[PDB]
Structures are given as C-alpha cells and as structure tokens.
UniProtKB/TrEMBL annotation, chain A:
Start and end residues of each BFN domain: 2-137
Coiled coil feature spans: none
Transmembrane region(s): none
Organism annotation: Thermotoga maritima (strain ATCC 43589 / DSM 3109 / JCM 10099 / NBRC 100826 / MSB8)
Organismal lineage: Bacteria, Thermotogati, Thermotogota, Thermotogae, Thermotogales
Name used for this protein in its record: BFN domain-containing protein
Record-level Gene Ontology MF annotations: nuclease activity
Superkingdom: Bacteria
Length: 137, 143
C-alpha cells in the first residue's frame, strides 16, 4: 500500500523562502514535495552531502543512541496528511531479533527523511499520498 | 570528578547575535558560558519554555527512540575543551553499569537534560579552568 521514494532534491521555495524536499516516487514520473523548516533543511542539506564532521550533530547522536541500544533505522514511511502536515513513521529494527522486532515511532517527515538519507534506509510514501498529492515536473 | 550544573540562561550574545548558554555551577557563584548554533539555540529555547507541540521535534524523536528501546537519559556531562570546542557525554540508562556513554555536543546534551530533567554535570577541570565567578554587579548585567 506504499511506493518506494527517494530524495530527488532539496529545493528552496523562493516565495516562502523555505526548503522543500522533492521526493521521487519509484514507479512514476511524479514527485511529492514536502515543505520543512530552515533548521530541518540545513540538517538534510548536510546529510545529503554525506561528509565528515568532527562532532556528532543531532541526527548523528540519534543514530548513535540506536546503535548503542542494538537497533537501527529499518525504513521510513510518509503515510498521512492532515491540516498541511504530513505524518511519518520511523520504523526501527531491534537487532536483538522475527519481523515483529520492528518498532514504529511517530516522526515528522523532516526527521525521518534525514535519518533515511543518513542510513541508506528505504523511504516509502503511501499510495494515498501519491494519488492525491504527487505532482509532475 | 564533577559539579552539578543547570541552565541559568540562554541568550543571543549582544555582539555576535548568536546563542550562548550560561550554565550555573551549583554550590558556587561560578558560571560556564557555552556558545551554540542558531538551530541548537532555538531547540534549547523551545525546550526551556517547555513548549508543547503537536508534532515531535528532533529531540523529542530521540527521546521516543530511547523510550521504545527501554532506556532513558541518565545524566549529561560537559567534560572537556579542545580548540574552542566543548565535548560532552550523553549517559543513557538501559532500563532492561547498565549505563552507556555517548559522545555528544554540549548543545544536544543540554537540550536532552532540559527536556527530561536529567542532571547536567561539568567536570572540575572545566570549572577550574573555564568557569567565571560572578560578582552581583556582573549578575545584574546578565539579568
Ligand atoms: Cl517536518
Ligand atoms: Cl554544541
């Protein structure tokens, strides 16, 4: 009931001067745009550069917390939209082990995408969001 | 070892107009200023305000991950300074020495302490070498 997606670009909405994630939807030529805050966009911009920093930023520290508790990002789902807000699930995998070892966590789309970018974990978008909110470019 | 601290104040430096966290060192009249980024300062402000939001911000997400994995923030330690950089430890307690030391920036660790109520500690080296002892005249200037 959901399509694989990826970060195509992090654009700027020069009208609202705000960052816009453009998710590609696999199986389509449509994209789903998601508006995020400035600090979120900066963190995603840095994550997508995939470069080395001498000190852990917040999402890095999240990922270190997961690692320490023998878990990892399994996937990310952008599933719902109400009142201009997309709702995401960070699906975490408990590595103490069999598929019921997945934990769903409420997340904003920004945080989820950033963690998926950092980890290589898959992003999914629900059919319904694609049907109703994906766009052509 | 180390001294208990609390966030006395978060403000924009009145010259560089960037955030500085003044930590108070309990049991003293000393404070430790730590300069942080614009985004970290906003996150800390929201946390200090105990701002209630419909959606989880990044630090909230981290704390829900902790909770999901049966763990809590235990305490936070600002322990070293190297080339203008403070180094911290996020100490996590596995609720299932079940304590875990995780390297942190001071910003993140102070944010997570403020949100959870976990104690902030500063090492005696930092206090001895970097804290400053305020006179009332200097506290009034900050206030
Ligand atoms: Cl978001
Ligand atoms: Cl910092």
């Amino acid at each position: 009931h959901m399509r694989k997606a990826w970060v195509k670009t992090l654009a700027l909405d020069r009208v609202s001067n705000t960052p816009v994630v453009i998710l590609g939807i696999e199986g389509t030529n449509r994209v789903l745009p998601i508006w995020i805050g400035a600090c979120e966009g900066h963190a995603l911009a840095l994550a997508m550069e995939k470069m080395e920093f001498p000190r852990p930023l917040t999402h890095d520290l999240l990922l270190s917390v997961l690692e320490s508790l023998e878990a990892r990002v399994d996937k990310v789902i952008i599933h719902s939209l109400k009142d201009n807000t997309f709702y995401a699930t960070l699906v975490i995998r408990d590595l103490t082990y069999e598929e019921a070892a997945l934990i769903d966590i409420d997340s904003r789309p920004s945080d989820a995408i950033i963690l998926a970018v950092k980890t290589g974990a898959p992003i999914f978008v629900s059919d319904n969001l694609v049907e109703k909110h994906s766009i052509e470019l």
